């Protein structure tokens, strides 16, 4: 994918139940695997901001639940550094449902998104109300 | 008076200016920015205020077309170019340059008088190119070649000036060969082309430079020089003094025939009516006359605008408030938006006599391919119907249980994309009965699915569905009640073919004057009494109430009707939909009170009887046919035909014109599978088939047993069926 | 198009039917393995 | 070079250091140090904390 | 001979090597090594290779022909390259 | 058995991992001469790390042109003295030292390292070397140099460090002439390296003493139930049954750190003369303040503070002429804060 300007620690590993913050009907999704991630022996799949993960909808509507979907993490509590040396951290972790190409299934994103994801996937930025 | 602000003014009166009017099209291949040079003809060339012109590829009425190197559908506009100090109205009606586009391409060409050529450098007369030259030849739409972006040959491949344009001199020669071989007579009749004589241009649409001997000379930058300038790298500065638009326009005015000339041309061949009425005369010999002789080319729309059904004013005049019929019925609607496709849209107006375009709105019930005219349209161009449905579908599955959710959106949505895909989307096991009637239809959507959304699903084999029907007049069968209190003596019999066609068209409507309908029925043939007793119709089957005396019956009609309907949904023989079957209630015997007249007693009786009736009436089955318009190369006929005939295909027309043998044969869908497959070997890899729902005919009696057998198991039904007596269990 | 002088060098050789090695047009035997049957390279 | 002020102590963020903290409602706060971040997360207020500039302002209000 | 279908080969001599630019649209030119005192002349659409050593002339021609090899596609469709029409 | 594979724990490219035999890194290779004569190496002492705000001038980078915070290592680099010229003869058995000429006057504190060579034969030694070069007995020439750490205050030592450096020249005669010019002089780091250029840094790494295989090689710990059965930080197996021996490739405890390491392509971001520009408030912790001329090396460097760091012109540099960095801000805030 296109490189991000910031250095992102892959903070969320497989099994994490993240709140889903769009209007698709998925409330909580559990990370199953990370796309484009090859691991090593004994290492759980890891994801930071800007990564696309295969997720399972654990809470939400009956249509969303039990579905294998693609999501992009837009907020992470683990601090990441911008190129100019400033460290950024969010109050929670948050993801949004997308396709393979990066288009969000939802139409509006409640909460701030990271500028890194906003630039890597421009449609997430337009869908989000504010980009931090 | 901001550009188009002036145009508007001139245009409103320009309408009745055929002399300068220039309704034309553009035909060639794709991936040659053909629809993009046409974007720049007027929108690109700022025919409106520059900010509001071609900035965001808005020119074409069908905005979505954008640019892929060729027309997408049949969008429309206008451009008032000046040539030798005169503002000619070059209504750009760029014609779709493809092959699949068919019965609609006909009228999408009738909208113009000349389709124009565009072939990028050493691309040549591609298979498609020649295909659209063939289609062009039909609608007498004279062309002019526009060899786009020769840059390839130039800068990239560097073929010396002379050579460079000699390759095109030959290409021109091939366009002449096209207009010779194909239709030899056509040639001399203006259709001839030539760079020298001026009826051929060239130039990069993406770089907007362009020339042609006339242009060449006038500008003083001969093609040789232009080569030198391109090669050098200044194609943009070249464009400046050789405006891509200009050339094209110049030719449309001068060389490219002004509408008037071949105003007739098209009609006769394209029109299937009397080309000698007021309307006919006007449309042919460039005149207005013809009581609002508009032609619904493509039923369109626009947000808070009107049903902008396109139709260049090939004859007549426009005004706001004209009760206009249609080529389907007599709707009669206020025609408020008699405007002209102008700027990057369709400038709505009123006063538009014959000459330019004539997209009328105010409607909401016609068909893409109608010919809406105030005049009582006896035989309008594509006088056609539309009553049809796919009958051989498949069972879209899911290679991965993870794509199911997605698949769900994919398929439920697809309706939007195409409503001809009646996606019978079951819900339990989910064997999604994705519409279809033939192999074409099958793959048609195949890709769509795996491209407009992309899913990991698959398909099964053709669902060989049909329409159950009978063939023999039976003898009154009594349908008793569960509680053995009531009774109904109903008889069944074949539905007359004339009647069949009648209701297949739909004219025979329930919401219709009795007296009136009655006459129609008698007309067809059904005797007076029987024809008057008709209560209801389902699908293409009629229930006749030819009884007299039974008290409290019409208060039961509901029930009995429904009973009938039910049977009509599910055959008594193959459990398949029933069509073209006439049922007639002779007698009855209902219980006095209402207690013993509930649905639970009525409905069975009716069902029972109707069904049994069918059984006894030598119930067979119908089968859809699909007219195979197959444009095999003229020469090729032996093999071409042999194929069809062998696949039990009742041969129809051979259509031998110039170098094109279009052998239709309304090939029974039964054996209408792998047409292209066979073709590639039968005709040494040379044939262009295309199919269309030929209609429901009788499945060959000989193979009935087999057919039924199959159907029975395919659905999962007992080998034998309740033979008469048993289903009629007294 | 297809150029004869390019075709002479590209498509005008024999192929061993056991190891697929190219051999001369006149060769009756594979040079790599000595197989006695060689087919012309399939140019269609 | 963006000049940033610590939300808690009111000190200028020295370039190449410091943190930005974002709440769910989009509210952004610059923190000069882990000390300021911890005191903000404890619910303590700068105006009540004496070593910060807001605490100093509150005290000098009298 | 020099033959191509769509991309015009830019063939020249830069000393003891032959530069073959735009070979099948490539942005990186091919390099063919010259052997001995072998004189290579690009006389338009053809190449003449004169020398005093048959070994050197044959190896120079072989170097050209192998540098102009299409090592990926079907040879029955893709035939671009420089081919010997006459051996030493 | 169907086995799960993993890359081997640690690198066998640095075996045996023993203590370096000296506290000074020795260069085994010298790069190609590509211009005017000059020394190919310098030597300074690591002070510590800070960070700068600079405009990204790196061509093709995504953040090029914008403000970026870059960590830098400060290396205090007093002028080195060119003590001697040594000539090397190449034969089948390799290079041998054939001649050496010491400078006539040398610093008195050199006696802490060696008994001082007298002011004896320098003219005739140089003419002997010239005769050897003319007759072809000399394969190349190197300059023996030494540092003068007495001028520093964060480095407690006054005994100089001595090391050989290559000379970069197009020909052996040019090398000899340049060495004669520079012999006995005091060379500044600007006479060896220029700002914005790439270099290779060699140093003795931080010593950690004796370390277990977990820290030394990065082997996994015992996991789950095995974590508390008595072998937690301890290798699972020393070998198979056969061969009947422990391989040298099995990760084991031993000396960790205090090895020679070379880092490649460290960019010089600033050549400074006044240490007040870089010294923070309160000084560098356990070091003090910079007083002489210094160098800023982009990124990290092997070795702790006060370790001798050898800089040499790059031997595997990829990028061409990089340019002069635009340092917009050097952080002098307290490192102890």
Curated annotation (Swiss-Prot), chain A:
The keyword Transcription does not apply. GO terms for molecular function: large ribosomal subunit rRNA binding; structural constituent of ribosome. GO terms for cellular component: cytosolic large ribosomal subunit. GO terms for biological process: translation. Gene3D superfamilies: Ribosomal protein L14 (2.40.150.20). SUPFAM superfamilies: Ribosomal protein L14. HAMAP family: Ribosomal_uL14. Binds to 23S rRNA. Forms part of two intersubunit bridges in the 70S ribosome. Part of the 50S ribosomal subunit. Forms a cluster with proteins L3 and L24e, part of which may contact the 16S rRNA in 2 intersubunit bridges. This is Large ribosomal subunit protein uL14. It comes from Methanosarcina acetivorans (strain ATCC 35395 / DSM 2834 / JCM 12185 / C2A). The gene is rpl14.
UniProtKB/Swiss-Prot annotation, chain C:
It comes from the Archaea. Gene3D superfamilies: 4.10.1060.50. GO terms for molecular function: structural constituent of ribosome. Coiled coil: none annotated. One of its GO terms (cellular component) is ribonucleoprotein complex. Belongs to the eukaryotic ribosomal protein eL40 family. This is Large ribosomal subunit protein eL40. It comes from Methanosarcina acetivorans (strain ATCC 35395 / DSM 2834 / JCM 12185 / C2A). The lineage of its organism: Archaea, Methanobacteriati, Methanobacteriota, Stenosarchaea group, Methanomicrobia.
UniProtKB/Swiss-Prot annotation, chain D:
Coiled coil: none annotated. Its cofactor is Zn(2+). Keywords: Metal-binding, Ribonucleoprotein, Ribosomal protein, RNA-binding, rRNA-binding, Zinc, Zinc-finger. CDD domains: Ribosomal_L24e_L24. Zn(2+) binds at residues 6, 9, 32, 36. GO terms for molecular function: rRNA binding; structural constituent of ribosome; zinc ion binding. A zinc finger (C4-type) spans 6-36. The keyword Cytoplasm does not apply. Gene3D superfamilies: Ribosomal protein L24e. SUPFAM superfamilies: Glucocorticoid receptor-like (DNA-binding domain) (SSF57716). One of its GO terms (cellular component) is ribonucleoprotein complex. Binds 1 zinc ion per subunit. One of its GO terms (biological process) is translation. Belongs to the eukaryotic ribosomal protein eL24 family. Part of the 50S ribosomal subunit. Forms a cluster with proteins L3 and L14. Binds to the 23S rRNA. This is Large ribosomal subunit protein eL24. It comes from Methanosarcina acetivorans (strain ATCC 35395 / DSM 2834 / JCM 12185 / C2A). The gene is rpl24e.
From Swiss-Prot, chain F:
One of its GO terms (molecular function) is rRNA binding. Signal peptide: none annotated. GO terms for biological process: translation. Keywords: Ribonucleoprotein, Ribosomal protein, RNA-binding, rRNA-binding. Residues 1-20 are annotated as: Disordered. The keyword Ribonucleoprotein applies. GO terms for cellular component: cytosolic large ribosomal subunit. It comes from the Archaea. The keyword Transmembrane does not apply. Pfam families: Ribosomal_L3 (PF00297). InterPro entries: L3_arc_euk, Ribosomal_L3_dom_3_arc_sf, Ribosomal_uL3, Ribosomal_uL3_arc, Ribosomal_uL3_CS, Transl_B-barrel_sf. NCBIfam families: L3_arch, PRK04231.1. HAMAP family: Ribosomal_uL3_A. Part of the 50S ribosomal subunit. Forms a cluster with proteins L14 and L24e. Belongs to the universal ribosomal protein uL3 family. One of the primary rRNA binding proteins, it binds directly near the 3'-end of the 23S rRNA, where it nucleates assembly of the 50S subunit. This is Large ribosomal subunit protein uL3. It comes from Methanosarcina acetivorans (strain ATCC 35395 / DSM 2834 / JCM 12185 / C2A).
